[PDB]
A paper describes a structure:
Efficient release of enveloped virions, which promote systemic spread of infection within hosts, requires the VACV protein E2 but the molecular basis of E2 function remains unclear and E2 lacks sequence homology to any well-characterised family of proteins. We solved the crystal structure of VACV E2 to 2.3 Å resolution, revealing that it comprises two domains with novel folds: an N-terminal annular (ring) domain and a C-terminal globular (head) domain. E2 also associates with KLC, binding to the unstructured C-terminal tail present on a subset of KLC isoforms. E2 and F12 function as a complex and both are essential for IEV egress.
The structure of VACV E2 comprises two folded domains: an N-terminal annular (ring) domain spanning residues 1–454 and C-terminal compact globular (head) domain spanning residues 455–732. The final five amino acids of E2 (FKSSK) and all residues of the cloning tag were not visible in electron density and are presumed disordered. E2 is primarily α-helical, with only three short β-sheets being evident at the apex of the head domain. The N-terminal ring domain of VACV E2 is particularly striking, forming a central aperture that is 2.3 nm (23 Å) wide at its narrowest point. The central aperture is too narrow to accommodate actin filaments (~6 nm diameter) or microtubules (~25 nm diameter), suggesting that the ring domain does not encircle cytoskeletal elements to promote VACV EV transport during infection. The head domain does share weak homology to protein and glycan kinase domains, and to the bacterial SidJ pseudokinase domain that possesses glutamylase activity. However, the overall structural correspondence is low, with less than half of the domain structurally aligned, and key kinase catalytic motifs such as the glycine-rich loop and catalytic lysine and aspartic acid residues are not conserved. While VACV E2 is an acidic protein (theoretical isoelectric point 5.43) the head domain possesses a large basic patch on its surface. Given the functional role of E2 in associating with IEVs comprised of EVs surrounded by trans-Golgi/early endosomal derived membranes, which are defined in part by their specific complement of phosphoinositides, it is tempting to speculate that the basic patch on the surface of the E2 head domain acts as a membrane recognition motif. Other noteworthy features of E2 include N-terminal acetylation of the initiator methionine, which was verified by mass spectrometry, and the presence of a disulphide bond between Cys residues 496 and 535 in the head domain despite having included reducing agent (1 mM DTT) in the SEC purification buffer.
Author numbering: 1 to 732
Amino acid sequence: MISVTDIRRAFLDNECHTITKAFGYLHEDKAIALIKIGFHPTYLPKVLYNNVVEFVPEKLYLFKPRTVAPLDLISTITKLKNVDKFASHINYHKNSILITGDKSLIVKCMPYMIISDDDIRFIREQFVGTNSIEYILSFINKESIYRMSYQFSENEIVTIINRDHFMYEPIYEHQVLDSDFLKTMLDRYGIVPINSGIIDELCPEAIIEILMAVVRPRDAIRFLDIVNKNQLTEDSVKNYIINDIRRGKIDYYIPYVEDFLEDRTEDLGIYANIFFEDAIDITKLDITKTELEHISKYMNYYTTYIDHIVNIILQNNYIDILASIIDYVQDVLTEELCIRIVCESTNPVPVTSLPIHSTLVMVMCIQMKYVDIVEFLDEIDIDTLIEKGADPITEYTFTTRWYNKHNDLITLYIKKYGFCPMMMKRLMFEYPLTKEASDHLLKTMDENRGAIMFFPRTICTLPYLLCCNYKLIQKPIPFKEENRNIVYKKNNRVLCFDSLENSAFKSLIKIDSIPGLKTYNMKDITYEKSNNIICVRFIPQESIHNEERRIKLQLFDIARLASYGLYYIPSRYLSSWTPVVNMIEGREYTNPQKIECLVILDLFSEEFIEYQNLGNAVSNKYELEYTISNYQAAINCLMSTLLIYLVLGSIRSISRTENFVLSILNIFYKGLKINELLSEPVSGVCIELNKIKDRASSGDSSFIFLKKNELSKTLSLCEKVCVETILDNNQS
């Protein structure tokens, strides 16, 4: 459990109403320490302003913009790369920032400043004679344009659209543009010319093509309005719009239909009533499932016929359609139907939209992993929820008032997250707790110190172990004298490096010193130098012919290298998958959307990085918001490699998937020198894996596509292997 002694002392001895207020009564030294690591309220009292400016300036945004001094603000954001959090400060002090005349400063601040016609006059004054005017203005935001009278020149508009393509949207509805300029922007940037500057009469084909290309409904409306002022609308255009309405594209055309298609309501059929109140009696029409899907978003126009529609839905078992109109059928929903919806619908419905909150409905929502199970507490007590397997501590719950209505939910929040600084920060500071709720929270955490509240399941979960802030101990490399009968390639290989300090060079040499590797072996290493450059000549191990054996033996080597402090970032397979970050922040995580390879390459192709530099390499490779430790980066690399070797390895495997998962994960243990065998149930994992295996033959693509939440059991097994990796490391 996170310690709360000091902040609870502050909360009680000053009779605060919120933990935010109590934070301000901490000793300035403790407050500043907490502020540095991000454990702070959303704002700070003025007494701390000088300490923040001196000791942690990047956190000045925690003061009201009026409280911050323009010099302090400008000194801070000059140093920072990301100033998103200073947006309201930057806007409030825009005049101070303009007066500086600093090109780099102004350009960094433009996306957050609401720029006025006067401000534009100041920029053209301070920068006349330089390339900078069209450069500075190219960083303007859509908010400035909406409130602006100024009109961009064409050069400005190009510079702006080169910097951010979709800035054409505010520009195109801000000002009248030359019609040849609109054509040039279409031929060259593919921008659809939706602007009042359209002057030439367009052929029926041209109108149909522009409609087929627009995406936002407001652009279709605008286009048609402009065009109708230039020319009459053809029967060819009218026909396409009716057929587009039949394809579900409705919002695009509501003004148009109401003004020009009044005499085509029989062609519009069931859709006509969206445009003309009760225009067609739909009971006399043959209604298709597709037509009901399209009008589901438009049911407020079919309330005259709501019974007929509901009846078609129930008679044809259109449960997804029933779910999509659930707000209109509250009176019809029996417990039986409520259950059907929960089990059969593609996407969940809100528990508040189910009028029946029986235990039976609740266990179906638990089975379907509904995120809003807490809403059954109007009928069912928290103990029955927990006994029946509910987890009400979700993101959904945080958007409700339930934490103030029920101190048992705050206790459950602590049991799930009391060790997790980011999640406790969120409840302590970013949730509108009551005095009594705030008191219960700090009391419960203070009287349950240590690990007792997380025993015996949570203390052995990966997120819990990531927040103990352990270390992975590296083992020293044993003496090597290679006696094995290794088959080497009949050709040598040369790798060159800019210097001998090169970390990749240093790890290649270290890996050569490591005994007992199965795939990463090298013969007859010679050196050649040219000033700083160092080249390594060597004869690589011949590749293992059996692909399944090769993949198993590569994971052994990965485990053995990790035990000695050498890791690799699997970014060629999972370019953005950092589940460790989710875990230490208390956020749920799921599988990546794809594996960017089909073939597991040999380990010679990867760059192995020292543990001591791993936190920095991982955070840079994945462009993380903040730098994670070497420990947490090591866990991410293992989690990534395990997922890749299980999924990709399965695909290329010829043995029974149950024996593959069990033997390659035991192979991983052996590389770690863990003497106990892995013995986990893999039946549920193998069903997930075999599904993906079957798409990989049918797909025929350059990547392996993974469906959302398809690998939950495989991920819990990757987690369990990492947990055992950490616990065994901590015994040594």
